[PDB]
């Protein structure tokens, strides 16, 4: 019975905020383990006698980032014997997201793709000349396509991406794109 792992408030956060990792098993367990990759020893472990265990990371630092896994254990189990591991949880702690690239896709109407390297982000298109953004879209993919209408296409554009909700982590703006 594989447990599942969750991160609150987010999977991508700035250094200094508090992250609560939450592991849950189908039936109550005695000991929950928080593992980094390949290490037999859990970094953190909680004795709870519950189906749920919360791991509180106060003021996260870029060291607390990485791939996490949850496993549980019962008292009557062998030594170094743990349950099925949960699906991975990649926690990213950074001041800033890596800069996106803004390109035009060939096909009249014009389509742009703001591309970063991080999944689950909100992408935002800015028009050089206008303050408020032109278009914005939330995507699971590390890119988003914007469609520009025919004769409103020519101009100077740039994009940035950010986390969907607070605490926000922002990327820098892409190099401007000339149409």
């Amino acid at each position: 019975p594989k447990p599942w792992l969750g991160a609150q408030p987010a999977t991508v956060v700035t250094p200094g905020v508090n992250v609560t990792l939450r592991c849950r098993a189908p039936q109550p367990a005695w000991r929950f383990g928080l593992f980094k990759p390949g290490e037999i020893a859990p970094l953190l472990f909680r004795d709870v006698s519950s189906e749920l265990a919360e791991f509180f990371l106060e003021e996260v630092t870029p060291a607390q980032g990485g791939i996490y896994r949850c496993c549980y254990r019962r008292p009557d189990w062998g030594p170094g014997v743990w349950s099925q591991p949960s699906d991975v949880l990649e926690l990213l702690v950074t001041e800033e997201l890596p800069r996106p690239s803004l390109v035009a896709l060939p096909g009249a109407n014009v389509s742009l793709r703001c591309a970063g390297r991080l999944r689950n982000m909100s992408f935002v298109l800015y028009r050089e000349g206008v303050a408020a953004p032109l278009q914005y879209r939330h995507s699971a993919q590390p890119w988003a396509d914007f469609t520009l209408l025919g004769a409103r296409a020519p101009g100077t554009y740039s994009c940035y991406y950010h986390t969907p909700s607070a605490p926000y982590v922002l990327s820098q703006r892409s190099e401007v794109l000339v149409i």
Partner: peptide, 22 residues
């Protein structure tokens, strides 16, 4: 029922590019 309270504020815009050189 009645509608929910308004959502959280949006994210800030991207930081400004550095200025021209001297």
């Amino acid at each position: 029922g009645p509608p929910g309270p308004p959502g959280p504020p949006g994210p800030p815009g991207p930081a400004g590019f550095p200025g021209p050189p001297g």
